[PDB]
Structure formats: structure tokens, C-alpha cells
Amino acid sequence: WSPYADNGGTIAAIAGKNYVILGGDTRLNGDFCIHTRDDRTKLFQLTEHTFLASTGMQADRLQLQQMLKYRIQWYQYNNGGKLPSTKAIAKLTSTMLYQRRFFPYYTFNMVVGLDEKGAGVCYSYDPVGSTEPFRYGTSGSASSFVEPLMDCLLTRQHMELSMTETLEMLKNAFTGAAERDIFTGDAVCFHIITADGIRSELFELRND
Amino acid sequence: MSETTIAFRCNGFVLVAAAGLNAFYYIKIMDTEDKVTQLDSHKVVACAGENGPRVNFVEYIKCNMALKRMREHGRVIRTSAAASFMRNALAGALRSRDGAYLVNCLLAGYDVAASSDDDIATGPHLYYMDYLGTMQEVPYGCHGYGASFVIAMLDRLWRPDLTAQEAVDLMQKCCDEVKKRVVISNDKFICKAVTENGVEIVNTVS
Amino acid sequence: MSETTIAFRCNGFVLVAAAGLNAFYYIKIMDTEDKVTQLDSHKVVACAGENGPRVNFVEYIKCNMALKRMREHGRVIRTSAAASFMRNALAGALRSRDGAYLVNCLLAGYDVAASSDDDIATGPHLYYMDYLGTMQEVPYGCHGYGASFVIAMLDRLWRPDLTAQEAVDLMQKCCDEVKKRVVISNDKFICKAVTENGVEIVNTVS
Amino acid sequence: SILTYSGGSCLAMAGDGCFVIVSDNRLGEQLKTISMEVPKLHVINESIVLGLTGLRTDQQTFSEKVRFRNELYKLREEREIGGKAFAALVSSMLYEARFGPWFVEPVIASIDKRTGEVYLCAMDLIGAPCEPEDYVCAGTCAESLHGMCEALWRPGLGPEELFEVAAQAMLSACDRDSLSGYGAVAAIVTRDKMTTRLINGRKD
Amino acid sequence: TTIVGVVYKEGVVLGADTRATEGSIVADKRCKKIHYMAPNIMCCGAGTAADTEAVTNMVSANLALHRLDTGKQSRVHEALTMLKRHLYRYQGHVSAALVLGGVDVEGPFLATVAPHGSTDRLPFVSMGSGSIAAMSALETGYKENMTLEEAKELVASAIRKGIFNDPYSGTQVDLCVITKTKTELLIGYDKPNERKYPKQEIRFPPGTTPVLREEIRRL
Amino acid sequence: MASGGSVIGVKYNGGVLLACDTLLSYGSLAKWPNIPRMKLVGAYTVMCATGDYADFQEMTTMIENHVNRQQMYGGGALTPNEVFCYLQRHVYHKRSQFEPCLCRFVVAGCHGGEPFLGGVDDVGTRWTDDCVAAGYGAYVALPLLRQALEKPGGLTREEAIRVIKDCLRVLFYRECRAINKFQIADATSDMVSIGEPFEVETNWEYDGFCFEKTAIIR
Amino acid sequence: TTTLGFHFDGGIILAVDSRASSGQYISSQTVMKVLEINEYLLGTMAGGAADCQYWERVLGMECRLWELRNNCRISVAAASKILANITYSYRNYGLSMGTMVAGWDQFGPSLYYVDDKGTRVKHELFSVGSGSIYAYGVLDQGYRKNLTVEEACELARRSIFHATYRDGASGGIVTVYHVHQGGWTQISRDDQTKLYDRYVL
Amino acid sequence: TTIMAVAFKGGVVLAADSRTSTGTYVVNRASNKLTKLAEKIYCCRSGSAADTQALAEQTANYLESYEIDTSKPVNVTTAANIFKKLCYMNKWNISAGIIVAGYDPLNGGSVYSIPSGGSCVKLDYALGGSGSIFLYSFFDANYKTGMSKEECVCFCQRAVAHAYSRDGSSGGLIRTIALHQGEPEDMTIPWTKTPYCMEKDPKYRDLAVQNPPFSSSAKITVNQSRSE
Amino acid sequence: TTIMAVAFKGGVVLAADSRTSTGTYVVNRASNKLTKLAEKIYCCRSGSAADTQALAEQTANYLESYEIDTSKPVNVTTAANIFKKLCYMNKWNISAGIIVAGYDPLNGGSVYSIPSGGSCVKLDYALGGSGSIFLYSFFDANYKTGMSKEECVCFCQRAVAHAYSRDGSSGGLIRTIALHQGEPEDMTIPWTKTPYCMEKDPKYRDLAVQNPPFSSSAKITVNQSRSE
């Protein structure tokens, strides 16, 4: 018996000048089998401008999502009803992960949302909580594929996008990951975050 | 045993020397760290070990000795009493939760009369200690990989009636033989004398 | 990595240096062993490792090269052919019953025309090898704990057109930095040049 | 790991009557770099290139054995060996060491002179082959390379377009790997000619 | 890997999936796992690929020598004996699991060979990491004296259970039908995993990559 | 270390079925063949588990007491969704103190004209779906039930019972620690009933199973 | 990782690279490895990123409280001592940390090294990280007390460059800071691949 | 696995179950563990399938050669001795418990046991496999010498059914063969017609009371069957 | 150890052997493994002597207090529940298999099994100890519900004799106690009057033929008894 299990799958995000787009796959894997093809626990809304996304062990992301939801509720009760910013939540998350240094959450997390100027931002964490702000990010079983592709198409060191064009690039990156990683597949849930609100969309992938 | 320490007493003094080296695995960071620390006007301790334990151990001894001084009208404490307190702190730590202090020491002092009622025999004293809490008064003593070479030399050449000049010469021969025969580089030594007038640096030894 | 070896080639020579130390655990037995061995009139190899494997490996290479010489009218063999034979002996031993020869080498030579029919490009050559049988031609190279310090210096200061005097100066700075920064004492170096006139000791380096 | 001790990576891609094969230039000892000028490609004859990754002593030993067998083949048979027979030969030499293996992972690319058909193969270290029609990859940044090619490769490219795709795949993957880099070398092979190019990359 | 066989009225049907993996990555989406042994005998393999390949090639060559010597058709029991003796000598170190099928003068024959060298002759089998899922369709669907068409539909349904439920199996179904007179291979008999969203094309303009040097050679 | 084998469940149009066998084993020994392994919880819910029977008993006794008391003391009747959440937090807490509940659970119920089905594993992983299983049921039965749920519209009660029996048949052929004696629970119309034990029909007489053909030496 | 610092006549120079690697895969090329603790003190990280970032933030909090309660700035000797007490108390709990602490106070410029076992050392020059063993080669060749600010910045930049070119775990962007009497300044940021083109002549 | 052999007046009966397993999954539900060594001599095999198949085949090869060289049918004692020698020379590298049994005109019906370790013991009956442990007491209470051939077939079928109802590693068909001066008679009973199983024994029909409903009394009555 | 309890019409019988051993040496040949918990409730103990003695004593202490506080005699289900809780809370530090059985006027005769792990199961009969494995088949073939008190004593004596004749870790006396509405009746059978042993079974009187004399024939006849 181990207290750890890897349930598989992949997340990715890309920020723009005034949006961020975030995607997670829906398969939950067991040992040599599949529990379900329609799990929705990888993305978790924290405010109207901020999401948590996690890969790794599903039981640990369920605990971390609830611990954050309660610290954010206490912040509103102690601050006149107001919600914390994306930057404030990102620092809180770092601090909560390090305080469990000695029996760590088995999770690879991202915080994504809009900053105060209204631009997208992605924070990626190692499991004890080191992070930095960046324009894109990915973690999970297919992340070593997707990440070099994002470097190639978005920074172009060896050689402004619309919401629509950015969403097409992620559709194509997940389609490629589903063909070559055995633990990623079935569907992607995408959230588009803008100042107005949050649009959602489901996208089919290969089922084998 | 990467750092060697040497000491010996003669009729009116104790000489104490220690190597300057600080290392990180196989890299020399510096070779001028002073490891012969002064505890009060007439006492020094030379310690061998990693910086963390060495510094935390000598600051703990210095603090307790300063406290004891002012609850006693500022009178100099005897060398055997300081030795007894150090041994009791090393042995205590060995059976504690945090574990032993991994340090090996030589403590040297010159005792001086408190008052006119004082019937103490005045003189120099030298105590060998190890990290477990073993403690023995000795005429000379050493720690580190170089220890065995120097001890044999002193068994051959030391006498109680060496003059100050003969003793400084003898300490320079001891340090040179450590450089000659030990693979681990101990290139600079710092040396101090303890006498009836206090503690002074000996500049002609290196 | 207790012994450091250094080499570099410029337009008409290769310089090769190695530390003299022989040790038994933490005791220096001697510090003047010559580890830069001459294989023929225009070739040397510098080896790092324990005496037993080092000596048995260079005597095996010397013997086979002498045999090959006399079944060939006494003609000097090319440096790339000697390198190829050494690599094949190291790789062979790795998959043998007795196990690998634990030695790391630098081989240097100056190729000279056999006859008037010879269309060989004359010049100096330097090959890095490791105990597994890896072999690469390089402009400069090093083994031992000191290697990383010297390589960075040479990346900064080496050029192909150094004169003989500039090169001897540059080799002395490399040896001094090993003494400054490596805990294991490497106090004496022996250095040799390989040129169109053969192999000579450079006495001004130590 | 013994396969990652020395560094290096290799990729090959197929097009319309052509292939491109690419390697990195680094040689190391774990994180220390010995040289920045060690490509891992070997030209066997006009129609065939072999890329070898793995431990460097076994790359040098195994490629010398392969060149020796190839020389004796030409004298016995009086012809050049073709790509499918060459890969079968290499697989047989690896399986001979089944229980004490050569630590190498070969990539093989060839073009049949007559027909214009391209043949690619990659093998594991005991000789099991895989023969796709698109691309093969091996070495320290294999997982990243495998994903770059799936995204950029498409059917029916000519020499120059196929070159661009292979260079970008090799440079993006090497930038996420500590053990492979310092630019790349590529061979472009058609029925008619063989071109070779040196590609500029990062210096870390 | 999922591999399957059944006996019908006049023959044997073998099946396999086509994915090869290293670790958690799909190395090859169309690996062939159905190997030729003789004109009347076929083999599918699970296990270490190199071991499976080597063993089946060696026995296929020794059966060909024996047909030239004797002048007679190869018997499936001979193939089975030769595989078993080789595997037993290496004590499981040559890790090949095999499904063997064929037809000779004594009718259809189907068997398995485990890596330690044990055998089993049966009317339906499965092996590989998808074997438990596939065997659930065989026990619910098998019957005596199936027609050829019933038998192809049953083998394809067993391989699809492995494809959809086991992470190490995938892509498509290959079949092989073996009768007294002929052996027919049907690669891509069923393809239930096409592309959903067409591949976006990413054009790099020629001249995009910086080059330092160039050499050319005519052939 | 009495232990139970496989459990399987499936949703149909109007309800949910849960099935397992009446056996507890101790290692390979088949020790008690007449044990009811399904437990009712409150008014709407039933649960079963694969693995350590003592841990199943401790956990279910504790949840049943909480549900009966909350109702008796004026805090309403817990729904299957709430019971499931509560179970999962208890299993995760024990995992986090290194004293795990060494079982895998399946929970089914019906409330509000809406059926529930879910699983929880011994590190606290949780999921809901149209079919769920534990033990060898996860390898043997899910492939068959997932194929039956592919038809559009959903299953009728009769189709659901028929595919459940095909699954139990295969478990008896291929799971070593099993017997041919099963119960089915049906949750539908905001209640649960547990049926009497029954047996399935099996085939042993194929020509290919005969003494001559299976012989090793001819 | 590679970090270095030294003390010359005009203050303290600090310089770093920017890569984060497990030991094969490169997770980032843009980590900031100099921590602006407050406006008169700097730290550096090597070892575990998370450990250095968390405990340096704790130390910045302790420095600001000192300033509120005593109405003056804490000395470098005290700041470094607060960090070394923390690491010493956790010496059996498996931190990985190799920091420098630098500042200019009433006794002048001071540079300390502090590690994960409670070590604390004061000296004129240090290098830390897996690339340190290459950077000391170049630095020991060029270092003297009488460098001008421009020469000292160049020496520091060239030393991190040579480490990045040979060590697999170092690379990215080279950053140089100057600690002076008025506090500290960021002097420069340069990609190590642009620097290669300026030094290969 | 459950195997056995029993002597009767003028011959022997061998019997077995048909299951082969990896521990908790059944790879073959219809194996045949009664292996022929000569016309009237068979063995029963337990342990590693690979090892027992290989040693049975080798023993059979040697008996066929011996029979051609002497021009007579072989005795049971010769088959037991050859088999014993192979088990004993290879004891550290195999997992095998064997029973050799058969008929010859010199000694009649004979049974030999060759357990792990390679000893050889001549008996009136022998038991082997994981399931044997359940049968020592069944034979101690219900076995007698001098049974007829039909008594002995029926007894061995019942014995195998009892062992496989309690042992998770045994199951499936019951195979028997009877060897005497006439022709060998094999028989296969399917699970559906087994002479004993727990599932149809009336003392195990009613379920234990583990789940009593919530009540105002401490009296235990019935299991809850419907929601409250 | 061999322990058991069986229900009959209006009560229970408990039975055990009397041996305690360190593996291959017998430290006590007359232990008593039927331990009293209340006037009509007993347990049977297997596993570590130290652990079972300590938990029986604690369970008995709690039942005596409960009985004084309510002024009524306790039910079997209460004793089983208290004992289960102690076995389950201490499962990682003990070796214990328990059977609790007794009579009370609410539920009549009841038997509960509490094996390693701390589960609790209510049954018609229970078996425990190393010797139990030999008895599953004996009960499957020869046990029926509704036996009388005298039938049930005789049956349990026979069952214990069969297990201890095959199990090296069991032996010595057979102890029984019968609990019903009347007074408890204990009985001890000595080995010399056991109802079954191998040593007196006539099918094991004649020795196997392992040591035949040197002969001119391959026929096997008798064991050599005197020197040539």
C-alpha cells in the first residue's frame, strides 16, 4: 500500500492581452484501467477571474481545492466582502504548498486569471510551491510534448494572436497529445476568461 | 579530521594552533578562518568540525560564562571549572534528541589569583576533549589527520622548560610536518599564546 | 580524481603536465612521481589512476608499439593509429572478466613524414580518453578534480598562435589555480613538450 | 542511467523521394561538457545513413564493427548493401548480445536508388525494429522530439521544406534538454545528390 | 497488446491490435503483430518484441528446412514442440508469449505458449495486457461450429474490448484467416479511431532556419 | 483477514442495479459461502465493497449510525450524494494518518427520481458514472457493460439484468475466489430492495474441452 | 545553477544565470535568482528554489519588523545571523540551500555565505552552485580590489558566461547587480548566446 | 490443484480438477493433468506447468525406448524410478509434486508418490496439490481397501468435489482414468453435475444475519431487505 | 491448536485440544483453551497465549460490571461486541483468533467468530486454529442442523480427534463444554480413549514396502526384517 496514486492527464493555458484560455482533459485513469471518461475535477473556479488547474493524484487536488476555497471565504469576511486578486491567490497557494513540505500534496498546479491591468497571466508550481509568472504553461503526462511546441509557435527564437486563433492552437496541441500519450484522451473542457465573463466549450478527442 | 589542531604547555604558557581551511567537498572556499577562539581574558578554545556546530557550541559556552561572571562580581573563573562545564554540555548533547555536537576541542588557560584569600596554585593548564565528552588534562595534545605525526614529534622534542623562543620554533616544525605529510591541504595556521598577561597572537608562525 | 592532468596544443607543439602525488589514504608517500610517460620519439601519454593499473596499461601499450615497429622497418607510427589501438584496449577490457582498467589518459604526438611518398599532413595532435574507451580529438583537455577550473581558464585564454614562451606562462597559471582551489594537495607538477624535434622536459614549470 | 551518460539525440524524416536526418553536436560526462563538435551520423554508402545514440564508447565500438562487416560484404558480394538488408544485419548483431547488450539505439534512413522508395527504422538496444512511414527519433530528448514531429510533419514534402521542419523540431527539443545541444548537423538525401548543412543553435 | 484466436468449422481466425509503446508513449501506431511461420501456420506475439521476433524467425527457418528434406506439409504440433523446447531451455529469460494457429491433415489447431515453455491446446484463447477484457467477449460469444463470418465478428469484438479498455492496446484490428487451402491476411479489418478534428497545417517559409555552412555531393 | 471479491453496478432508465456474490474468503480458502455483503444506509442508499471485510464493517456501522441519528434528532434524511461525500472524506482522512481503509467501495441509490452510482478507492479517489465496479469486475465486467451502454436511449430494466448476468457468468469462469451464488439490489422509486440469492447457467461441454484434445502426450 | 559575489573597493557585485533543471529536463530559462529582500539587502538562491524563496521572504519580514520597533536598519551581520539560526534549527530536516547575503551598512560593505546546515562565513569572494567549479577559474584570474565599477561588472559577467558554456545545469540570461552606499542597482541582463558572439573574436 | 490416485482390487484410479491459474485469475479452465507415460501407466502433475510437462515428456521418451529394446510392456516401478531420478537431480530448480500410477501383470495396480525433494514412496493411495490438505481427513474417515472399480471411481469423484469447493486454486471439470488389465476408461464430469458443491448444499442456503434492521430490541431475527 | 463451537437445539458446544507449543517442542500438554467470560458464555482461544489471556480477562471484567449495573444476566451479542472492539483496535500488535459462544434466553444458543483482523460473523458453527483446515471437509460432509446435546458432544469429540491426528501442532486431551438453560457440563477425554487416531486405524497397520530384499526378480513383496 502506498498513499500515492497517479491518475494521469494533462492541462494547458495561454494568456493574451485581455483574456486567458485554459484546458484540461477528462479521463481518470486507474492501474491498467480507466475509471471514467468524464471527470471534471481538473479545473476549479476560485473567483470570477481566477481558476486552479491540477494534475497528478485526484484525491489531493480535491483536498487542495477545498482548502483554498475556505481561505478565500475567510479573506472576504475579514475584508469587507471583497475578493482577492489573481496575484494574492497565487502567493497564498505557494505558501500553503510549502507548509506541507514534510508530507506534500502529489499535485502539479497552475493558477490562471486576469491581473489588475486586465491581462492574462499563468503561474505554474512545483509540488512544494516555487513559481513564476508566465504567458503559457502545461503540466501532466503529455507536458513534455506540448511545452516545446508552445515555445516554437509563441516565442519563435529560432526563426498578437486573437482569442479564436489561440483556441485553435490549443485544440491542435491536445489532438497531438491524445495520439501519442496513453493516459490523455476522451475530451477537453476549455474555459475562456475575459473581464465580461467566462465562456466554456467541450472538444472531443480519440477514445482509445 | 580535515583540520588539524595542536597545543602544548610549558612552564609559563600554553601555545595553541589551528589550520584555517574551510571546504565544500573538494573545493577550498577560504584558508584563513580563525578557529582559535578567545573565551575570556586568559582562556582560548581551539575546535575542529563543521562551521555550524563549531560556532553554535562556542557561542553557547561564551554566553554561560558571561552570565556566571556577572552573578559573581566579575571574577575570573578557574580553567578546571570551565572544562567541567564544557564536558557536561558535550555529554548532555550525546544523549539528547538533537544528537551530539560533532566538535573536538582543546581548552587552554592561565589561572590567576582572585584575591588575597585565594590559595589557588597559579599556572597554565591544558585539557583535551572529544565530541563524546571525554576530558583529560594533558601536557600536549592534538586533533585531526595530522595529530599522530605531531604527537610523536612532541614525545621526542617537548620539555617543560622550553623558553618562549624555543617553543615558537618547535610549533613551526610541527605545522611544517602536517603540510609535508597530510594529503588534505592545511596550508595556513593561526597560533596564540596564553600567559599571565593574557592572550596574544604569534605572528611568526603560519 | 586525486591527481590532475592538463594538456593543450598550439601551432607547433603540445604541452602536457601532471601532478606528482602518490598517496595511501590520507598520507602523502611521495610527491615526485613522473606520470607523463614517453611512448616513442614523438609521443607521450599522461595517465591518472592508481599505480598498479596505470603502470600495467602503459607497459602493454609500449610493448605492442615496439613489436609493430620492427615488423615495419622501424617506421614511426601515426598518432591516430596509436590512439585507435589504446581505445580498443580500454573498451576490450571493459567487457572482459578482469574488468576495466581504471585509468584516464591524454595522448599527444607530433606526426612526421615517413618517406618522400608520404602525403600525411604533418602536425601536433591531442586526444582525450576515458577509462570506458571514449576517445575524442580536442584542442585542450584535462582529468581530475582540478579539470573544471583549468578548462574554464583555457576557454578564456587559449589561442592557437601562442608562442612557446606565452604557452609556458599559461601552463604555470593553470597549475597555480589547481593548488589554490583543490583541497587534495597537488603541490608539484611535471611538464613536457612534444615538437618536431621530439620530447623535452620543461624545467621552469612546477 | 547508462543511456543518458554521454548526451545526444537523433531524428530522421521521410518526404517525396527524399529524407532528412539530423543530430546534435554535444559530448559529455553527465552534466560536464567535453566537446561541442561531435555529430553522431555515419554515412554507410550513397543511399544509407546511420545515426547512433547511447553510451559513447559503445557508439564508437559498434560503428567500427558495422563498417568492418560492410567492407567484407562488398568484397564477397560485389555490390552495395541496401537499407532493408542493412537494418536486418544491425538487428542480428544487437541480438547476439542479448544478455549483455551494446548500450546504443540506432536510427537508419535509406532510399532505394531505382524506385525512389524511402525506408526508415529505429531499434531498441537488443534489436527490435519499428518501421513507420513518417519519422523516427532517439536519444536524451526523445519524448520532446517525438511530440514536435507529430505536430510539424506532413506527407509529401520536398527536400527544402522537409529540411525546415526537421531543423525546427531538433532545435525546440534540444532547448528543453540539458544533455543535448550546441547546434545540429543535417544530411539531405535524394536519388541524385547528398547535401549536408550545419545549423546554428544556442550555446548553453 | 491484445492477441486472440478462435477455431471455427473449417479453420482458425487470429486477431491483434497494432499499438507499440515505450513507457507511457506510443512509439508506433501500426506495428504488425501477426508473423508468418509456414504456408498453413501463423503466430501472434506478445512480450518483449525482440524475443518474440527472434524465436518465430528461428522456428520458421527450421520448419522450411524440414519441408525440403521430408517433402511434406508442416504440422502445427511440430511448430508447437519446437517453440516450447527453445523457451524451456532459457527458463523465461526469453520472454515471448505466443498464440499459434494453423490447419494440417488432422484439421484446425490452436494453442498458446507461455514464456516458461508451457502449452495449452484450446478452442479460444487470448494473451497480452488486454487479455482479460478480450476473454470477456469470447466467453459470452463463443459457440461450436461457428461460420467464418460469425468467427470474424467475434474476434474483432474481442480485440475492440482491449482497444477501448486497456491503455497499452490501441488503434485498429488486424485479422488472419487460415483454411485448409489458403491463408488470408486482413490488415486494417476495422478502423474505429479516425481523426475528429483535421490536422492544422503549420507552414515554415523556406529560409526560416539559420545555417552557417553547406557542402554538396553528386552521386 | 476475511475478504470479499467483485462488485458491479449499472444505471438503467428508471433505476440502478448493484450485484455481488455471497462469499468471504481467507486467502485462497473459501470460508463462508452464505454472507450478505450489501448494506442499506438510510432511506435511499445501498453500498458494497471489495477487500477487507472488517474495515467495511467498521466504516458502514459508523455511517449508518450518523444517518439514523441525524434523522431522529431533527436534521432530515441524507441523500445518496451526501452519504457518498461523507464516505470519501473519512477514507481520505484515514489515508492521511497512514491507517488506511483497505477496501474499494461502490455506492448506489435513488432520490428525487434521479439514480446515483459512484466508486471510492482506498486512497480517496472518487468518481461517478453509468457503470462502476470493484475487484476483478473492473477488468472483466466494465468492458461488457460499457458496450451495452453504447446503444442510444439507455437500457431497459430487462436488458440491464441480462447484461449483469453475463458479467457474473464470466466472473465465475475466470475469478478464482468466487462461487456461483449472487444477489442483486435494485434502487428505483426512491427505495432500495435486495433480492434472494440465485445462480447462473454455465457451459462445460464444448468438444474442445474433451480428454483426448487437451492431452499433453498423444 | 551558478551564482557569484565579490567585494571590491566600490562595493559588492553579484551575478547569476537563470535555468532551472531537475538534471535532464529544463523546467524554465527565466527564474530570478537574486532576491530583492528589501532596498538595502540582497540574497541569492542555489539548491532548492522553494526553500530559498520561502525562507528569504521570512527574513525580509523580520528585517522590516526590526525597522519598525527600533527606528533603524538592521546590520548585515544580524540579518545573516537570523537566516543561519533558522537553517541550523532545521539541520536534521533536509533543506537544500546555498545563499549569499550582501549589503552596505555602517561598517561598510559585507558579504556572507549561509547554507542549509547552519554554516555562516564572511569572506571577500564566493561562487555557489553546480557551475561554481568553472566560474572560480575565470574569477581568480581577474579579481583584484582596485577594479573600477565597469571592469568589475565585466569580470562578473564573463565568469558566469564561461560556466554556462560548460555546465549542463546552467544557462539562460546573465544578470549583474551592484550593492553600493545608496542601496543597490540592477546593472544589466544579457542572453548567454548573445554574449558568445561578443566574446568569440 | 487437486490430484490423487487410489488402488483397488486389480488396478488404480487417477483423478484431478481442471484449473490452471496465476494466483487469482484462471488462465485455463479445462487443463488436463492426467498425462500418459505408457499404455497402462499415467502420472498426475502439480506445481509448475512448464516443469511437469517437460519431465513427463522426457520420462515417456525413455520408457518407449526401453519397451522396444526388451520387446515387453514396462512395469510401474520402472516408470517411478526414472521419474524420481529426474525430480531429485533437478530439485533446486523446479516446482513439482508427481504421482505415478498404473497396472502391470507382475505387481497388479501400483501407486507411487514423488513429492518435492525427490523422495519415492509406495502406497495404497496418494494425494497432492494445494487441495490435498482438505482431503486427509475425508480419507481417514471414509476410505477402505478392497473397493471395486465402480466404487473407486465414485469415491474419487466425490473427494475431488469436496476439495475444490473449499480451495480457490482448484475448480472446473473432474477428470478420471481407470487402469486395469482391460482397456483404459477415461471420464469427464462437468461442474453442473458435480456430486458436491456448497452452492447447492441446503445447510448453506439461508444467509447469516449480519445486517439486522434498526430496532427497539436486542433480539436478532432477520436481515434487512428493503429501505425504511 | 484446534478449536470449534457448534450450535444445537437450545444451546452450544465448545471443544478444543490441550497442546501449547514453541513450534516443535511441547511446553504444556494440558492447557485449557476454553475460557469463561460469564456464567453461560465462554470463548475459545487461538494464537498467542499472552494476547488471548490478556483480552479474555479484560472482556470478562467489563461484563461483570455491566451485569451489576443492570441487575440482569448478559446476552451473547454483548460479549461478542466488546471482544470484537478489543481485537480490532489492537490488530497490528496481536495474534488472535477468537470464538465467542453461549446461551441467553432472548436468542437461545449463539456462536460468533472473530478471526484475525477483527471482523465479527454470526454463524451456526465456527472453526479456528492451525487444525481447522483439516475440518472444513469433515463438516461439509457430516454436519447437520438440529442435533441433540448428546449428538453434538459426540460429533465435536470426533472432529477434534481427526484434526489432531493430522496436525503436529495439536494433540493431548479433548476438552468440551455444553451451555444451555441448565447447568454447564464440562468433559475431558484422555488420549488413551480418543475416538480416532492413525495408530489404531487398521488401514495403517501394515507398513509400506520401502526396503525390499536384494532379489533375482522385479516383483515387490515384503520388507527385509533380518540380515542375510
Residue numbers in the entry:
A (entry chain a): 33 to 191, 198 to 246
B (entry chain Y), C (entry chain K): 1 to 206
D (entry chain J): 2 to 205
E (entry chain I): 67 to 285
F (entry chain b): 1 to 218
G (entry chain Z): 111 to 311
H (entry chain H), I (entry chain V): 55 to 282
Show the paper's wording.
The 14 subunits of the T. cruzi proteasome were cloned using the biGBac system for Gibson cloning and coexpressed in Sf9 insect cells. The protein subunits expressed from these constructs assembled into a complex that could be purified by nickel-affinity chromatography via a C-terminal His-tag on the α1 subunit. The native proteasome structure was determined at 2.31 Å and the recombinant structure at 2.25 Å. While the resolutions of the two electron potential maps are similar, the clarity of the recombinant protein map was considerably superior, particularly for many α subunit regions, allowing accurate protein model building and confident placement of over 1000 water molecules. There are only a few areas of the recombinant T. cruzi proteasome where the protein chains could not be modeled due to lack of density (the loops of α5 residues 125–131, α6 residues 52–58 and 201–203, and β6 residues 192–197). Where the map density was clear, the amino acid side chains were consistent with the expected protein sequences, there being no sign of any insect proteasome subunits that could potentially have been incorporated during baculovirus expression. There are three cysteine residues which exhibit differences in the native and recombinant maps. In the recombinant map, the side chains of β1 Cys 174 and β6 Cys 227 show extended linear density, while β3 Cys 138 shows extended branched density, suggesting that the cysteines have been oxidized at these positions. However, in the case of the T. cruzi apo proteasome the two equivalent residues (His 233 and Phe 236, respectively) already adopt conformations comparable to those seen in the liganded L. tarentolae structures, which would make similarly large side chain rearrangements unnecessary for ligand binding. In addition, the reliable placement of >1000 water molecules in the recombinant structure is highly relevant for drug discovery, as water molecules often play a crucial role in protein-ligand binding.
